[PDB]
Amino acid sequence: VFALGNNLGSTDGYLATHSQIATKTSKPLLETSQTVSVITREQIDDTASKTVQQAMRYTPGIFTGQVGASNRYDYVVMRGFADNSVDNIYLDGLKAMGDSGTFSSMQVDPYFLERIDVLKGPSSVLYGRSLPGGLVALTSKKPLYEDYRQITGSIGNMGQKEMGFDFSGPLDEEKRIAYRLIGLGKGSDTQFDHVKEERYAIAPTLAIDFSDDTTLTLQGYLQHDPNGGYHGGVPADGTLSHHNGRHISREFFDGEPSKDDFDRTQRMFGYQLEHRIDDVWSARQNFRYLDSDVDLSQVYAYGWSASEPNKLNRYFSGAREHLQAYIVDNMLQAEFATGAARHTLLTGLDYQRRRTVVDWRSGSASALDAFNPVYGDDAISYFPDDNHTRRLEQTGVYLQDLIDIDQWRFSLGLRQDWVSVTDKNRSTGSKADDDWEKFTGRIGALYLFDNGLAPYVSYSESFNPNAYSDASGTPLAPTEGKQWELGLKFQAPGSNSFYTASLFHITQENVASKEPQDNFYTSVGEVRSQGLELEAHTQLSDNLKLLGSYTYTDITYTKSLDGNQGHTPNQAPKHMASLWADYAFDAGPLSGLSIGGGARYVGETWADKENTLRVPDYTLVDARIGYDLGKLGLKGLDVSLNANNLLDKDYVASCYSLDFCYFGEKRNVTATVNYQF
Ligand SMILES: CCCCCCCCCO[C@@H]1O[C@H](CO)[C@@H](O)[C@H](O)[C@H]1O
Ligand SMILES: CCCCCCCCCO[C@@H]1O[C@H](CO)[C@@H](O)[C@H](O)[C@H]1O
Ligand SMILES: CCCCCCCCCO[C@@H]1O[C@H](CO)[C@@H](O)[C@H](O)[C@H]1O
Ligand SMILES: CCCCCCCCCO[C@@H]1O[C@H](CO)[C@@H](O)[C@H](O)[C@H]1O
Ligand SMILES: CCCCCCCCCO[C@@H]1O[C@H](CO)[C@@H](O)[C@H](O)[C@H]1O
Ligand SMILES: CCCCCCCCCO[C@@H]1O[C@H](CO)[C@@H](O)[C@H](O)[C@H]1O
Ligand SMILES: CCCCCCCCCO[C@@H]1O[C@H](CO)[C@@H](O)[C@H](O)[C@H]1O
Ligand SMILES: CCCCCCCCCO[C@@H]1O[C@H](CO)[C@@H](O)[C@H](O)[C@H]1O
Ligand SMILES: CCCCCCCCCO[C@@H]1O[C@H](CO)[C@@H](O)[C@H](O)[C@H]1O
Ligand SMILES: CCCCCCCCCO[C@@H]1O[C@H](CO)[C@@H](O)[C@H](O)[C@H]1O
Ligand SMILES: CCCCCCCCCO[C@@H]1O[C@H](CO)[C@@H](O)[C@H](O)[C@H]1O
Ligand code: NA
Ligand code: NA
């Protein structure tokens, strides 16, 4: 059974019925007063989404182009909040624990995942430090109680190859002990010259039921990326416009192949302990330890040379980082009635502790011709080293009551967080050290009509430690998010279809801002994001499945000291939409065959915060064809062909500023063979 900390419910095709993302306890999506999306394993496989970030491309309120084609980190911009977008990811109910002030952000390979859940808007009441756009919760594959065996292989353009396995089953005749073991090896050249991606990973899991009341699940996840793909950008000047009659190529590499390394090792161990005390009382402990090593060498472009016409100026970043992090969450839940009201009352204590030891290097590199570059001039003039030890501790105590009474579904939550952040500059010996407390709250009310229509309203809050520091090196006050949301969900009690609309108004306060003059930031900035999201899952008779989305987002610097007050953040489309369909033939000659595809639309974006130049809009097309060869008498064998960006559009995905613009992925074609046995 076991509601606490579990999604439960069911999924069919692309549609899940329940989640725990918004509540830390299984709750129908239809009866949850927040916007929640779920991306199923089937959707991930059918769209050939090769990373978490790419899996989100059909979900509303999410921009998946922050660094264009790069696959090194998962950047999920939610409701237009791009800053600290690498810190939006949770895994098995626990913050991933990367350090967004360093190069040590972790990445979870999609092959380990059963599903991806997305919660929109401020959500600190259950999770503590987090961003005002929302957060993403990955659920890993868990042990199965019947023998399961899959082997999978892929080949594609851009030198892509991948082999994986996924084995699961009971170890004892009683089916009380079950294992899963998943492994993978993959590689790609990318679109970019001289670049490699490569990964090897293994994830063992063991689940043991001590009785009907207790389950312990033991988890390991070991991942080695000896190469890190591409993570660079070039000027707007020759991408969004010609530069002396030319455009920089979408395959251009601005670095030095002899001095281009990204080596990331992620070692995780953890456990989940689920204990039913009573039909009333349940308790759960989720734990994860993380230890990672990252080594980086990168020569990158930064603007055009003032003396040499078609050459880009370049610089060098170098890093050796070691991250350690502990995270535990302790939950105790009472479910009980008091006359006509049912209460699901949760109390929790969570604890995060992170240390990141970083040795950073930087310098000046030789200039490079942006067309016809000549590689090999890799000498760096180094600038002064910059070594730090960065520490974070967060303790949270939280309370939530889900109250169902008649057709009303109410949610009430409060959390107190004690946060301590320290940054020891090991080069200079000086130490910044700060401590503070924050209280966050949430209130939701939803009315469930018996035809399956559910209007709701939610008020919800968030906070996050400020990435900036003041006139004394001491970090500014944490940023804060506050959101009003009004929504409507619909599922007809018949259907395997689900439809939602959400309207939102988010304010983020204490954002760092400064006059151009000054060197010190103050926490007087404010950002406002408001808009509309529409999501539709329409599934007809187990052979035609559709998903579609529309997003309207109006985000603005409502208070800024730097000249940009009233401007729109860059990397924030006002309009996005998407539509994906998949058709399976089930009888007749063609049976076993499936055809699918979709289109994604991203509206215009500002290339810069000064709002002087637009990144054009783009529409991308995806397609798939699958065949179950079991129909020719080889059960468990199937093949598929995918093409993302089928028309091979060559475009700029977004820009961070006028200096750094990113190309979108070219056409990506993969062929896959899956063997069950
Ligand atoms: C956490 C990773 C653990 C990997 C486990 C190795 C694979 C399982 C070992 O073989 C299994 O032994 C059992 C009898 O003892 C049988 O039930 C089963 O039929 C048989 O195939
Ligand atoms: C669990 C079993 C794993 C099996 C391994 C599958 C293939 C892994 C591909 O790795 C590497 O890709 C690089 C980048 O393109 C190439 O430079 C290199 O030549 C190649 O060796
Ligand atoms: C303000 C108090 C904060 C809430 C405390 C939450 C306690 C939950 C601790 O974990 C659970 O507790 C059980 C104890 O019975 C054990 O089975 C096991 O440790 C785990 O399952
Ligand atoms: C609650 C028990 C968790 C302690 C061990 C892992 C915590 C994650 C960060 O590790 C760091 O390890 C250093 C060891 O030299 C110490 O400075 C200190 O422990 C901590 O800053
Ligand atoms: C062997 C590793 C697994 C251990 C399981 C940890 C038990 C859960 C209680 O967490 C504790 O919460 C406190 C908040 O008051 C922190 O101050 C303290 O440091 C932290 O440890
Ligand atoms: C059972 C959970 C209780 C909290 C556990 C953490 C140890 C006590 C925290 O003391 C300190 O108090 C300061 C102001 O008084 C806060 O601003 C700051 O964050 C914190 O360092
Ligand atoms: C954000 C919206 C606020 C909703 C207002 C609170 C509704 C309380 C739940 O009870 C409802 O209303 C009557 C109140 O007396 C009851 O008689 C009856 O049980 C039920 O119909
Ligand atoms: C295509 C556009 C779809 C619009 C989607 C948003 C619908 C939000 C409804 O929320 C409800 O609003 C009513 C009036 O306030 C009240 O019943 C209550 O306040 C609140 O529960
Ligand atoms: C538009 C989507 C539906 C939600 C509507 C709820 C009311 C929105 C207004 O919110 C408030 O507006 C003021 C603007 O300065 C401030 O009081 C504060 O910053 C903010 O909290
Ligand atoms: C479904 C397709 C409809 C497309 C209509 C084109 C409008 C594109 C909107 O760009 C936005 O225009 C605002 C001023 O109008 C700027 O504030 C905002 O800064 C900017 O991002
Ligand atoms: C649902 C399946 C749709 C199949 C897509 C048809 C287009 C096939 C052509 O693509 C190109 O093939 C080259 C090698 O032939 C690659 O090197 C190149 O990089 C790739 O762009
Ligand atoms: Na929400
Ligand atoms: Na990689």
- The residues, ordered by sequence, that sit 6+ positions from 211 with a Cβ below 8 Å of its Cβ are none
DSSP string, 249-275: -TT---S-GGG-EEEEEEEEEEEEEEE
Residue 266: both structure tokens together: 């992620």
The residue type of 627 is: Y
Instruction: Answer yes or no: are the C-beta atoms of 301 and 234 closer than 8 Å.
Output: yes
Ligand closest in space to the Cα of 575: 10
Alpha carbon 110 to chain centroid, angstroms: 11
Instruction: Answer yes or no: are the C-beta atoms of 502 and 485 closer than 8 Å.
Output: yes
* Nearest Cα residue to 141 out of 170, 167, 176: 167
Q: Which residue has the tokens 């626990």?
A: 94
> Which ligand 2 atom is the nearest neighbour of the CA of 164?
1
Distance in angstroms (rounded) separating the CA atoms of residues 198 and 111 = 15
* Nearest Cα residue to 367 out of 257, 254, 258, 261: 254
* Nearest Cα residue to 468 out of 423, 402, 517: 423
Residue 184: both structure tokens together: 């993978």
Instruction: Answer yes or no: are the C-beta atoms of 164 and 110 closer than 8 Å.
Output: no
**Closest CA to ligand 5's atom 15:** 395
- The residues whose Cβ lies within 5 A of ligand 13, an ion, are 197, 199, 225
Report whether residue 204 contacts ligand 1, using a CB cutoff of 6 Å. yes
DSSP string, 76-99: -EETTB-TTGGG-EEETTEE----
Question: Where does 306-430 show beta strands of DSSP type E?
Answer: 311-338, 341-369, 381-382, 386-405, 408-425
* Nearest Cα residue to 168 out of 202, 193, 204: 204
Report whether residue 183 contacts ligand 2, using a CB cutoff of 6 Å. yes
**Closest CA to ligand 4's atom 18:** 355
Could you tell me the distance, in angstroms and rounded to a whole number, from the CA of residue 25 to the centre of ligand 3?
15
Strand partners, 423: 390, 432
Q: Which residues line ligand 8 (CB under 6 A)?
A: 455-457, 486-488, 501, 503
Report whether residue 195 contacts ligand 2, using a CB cutoff of 6 Å. no
Distance in angstroms (rounded) separating the CA atoms of residues 553 and 305 = 37
Could you tell me the distance, in angstroms and rounded to a whole number, from the CA of residue 407 to the centre of ligand 7?
10
Q: Which residue has the tokens 């006359």?
A: 339
Could you tell me the distance, in angstroms and rounded to a whole number, from the CA of residue 672 to the centre of ligand 12?
36
Distance in angstroms (rounded) separating the CA atoms of residues 480 and 438 = 10
Residue 108: both structure tokens together: 């979870």
Q: How many Cβ atoms from other residues are within 10 Å of residue 170's Cβ?
A: 17
Could you tell me the distance, in angstroms and rounded to a whole number, from the CA of residue 159 to the centre of ligand 2?
10
3-state secondary structure of 630: helix
Q: In what order do the strands lie in the sheet with 94-95?
A: 36-40, 113-120, 134-140, 89-91, 94-95
* Nearest Cα residue to 221 out of 137, 99, 107, 105: 107
Distance in angstroms (rounded) separating the CA atoms of residues 659 and 654 = 12
Ligand closest in space to the Cα of 645: 11
3-state secondary structure of 125: helix
Distance in angstroms (rounded) separating the CA atoms of residues 338 and 88 = 37
φ and ψ of 378, to 5 deg:
-110, 10
- The backbone region for 461, taken as left when phi is positive above 0, alpha when psi lies in -120 to 50, beta otherwise, is beta
Instruction: Answer yes or no: are the C-beta atoms of 222 and 267 closer than 8 Å.
Output: yes
Instruction: Answer yes or no: are the C-beta atoms of 225 and 105 closer than 8 Å.
Output: no
Q: Which residue has the tokens 């199937």?
A: 638
- Best of 641, 668, 669, 670 to mutate for ligand 11, by most ligand atoms within 8 A of CB? 669
**Closest CA to ligand 9's atom 8:** 505
Report whether residue 220 contacts ligand 1, using a CB cutoff of 6 Å. no
Report whether residue 656 contacts ligand 1, using a CB cutoff of 6 Å. no
Q: How many Cβ atoms from other residues are within 10 Å of residue 381's Cβ?
A: 11
Q: Which residue has the tokens 């993969």?
A: 670
3-state secondary structure of 124: helix
Instruction: Answer yes or no: are the C-beta atoms of 137 and 389 closer than 8 Å.
Output: no
